[PDB]
Amino acid sequence: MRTLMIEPLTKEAFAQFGDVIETDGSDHFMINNGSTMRFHKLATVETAEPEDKAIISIFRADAQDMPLTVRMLERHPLGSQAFIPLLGNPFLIVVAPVGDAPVSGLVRAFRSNGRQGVNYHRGVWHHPVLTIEKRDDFLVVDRSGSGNNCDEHYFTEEQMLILNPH
Residues lying near Na ion in the complex (CB under 5 A): 66, 148
In degrees, rounded to 5, the angle at the alpha carbon of residue 89 between the alpha carbons of residues 105 and 64 is: 55
What track of x and - describes contact with a copy of itself for positions 68 through 107 (by CB under 8 A)? --------------x-xxxxx-------------------
Stretch that binds a copy of itself, among 7-15, 42-50, 91-99, 101-109 (CB under 8 A): 42-50
Q: Which is nearer to a copy of itself, 10 or 26 (CB)?
A: 26
**Neighbouring-strand partners of residue 152:** 74
- Please state whether beta strands 68-70 and 72-75 pair in parallel, antiparallel, or not at all (unpaired): unpaired
Tell me the CA distances in angstroms from 122 to 12, 109, 125, one per residue in order.
18, 18, 9
- Please state whether beta strands 2-3 and 161-163 pair in parallel, antiparallel, or not at all (unpaired): parallel
Site for a copy of itself (CB under 8 A): which residue of 1, 8, 25, 36? 36
Residue pair 110/19 in contact (Cβ under 8 Å)? The answer is no
Judged by the rule CB under 8 A, the positions of this chain that interact with a copy of itself are 21-23, 26, 28, 31-32, 35-46, 50-51, 53-62, 64, 82, 84-88, 115, 117, 119, 128-129, 137, 139-141, 144
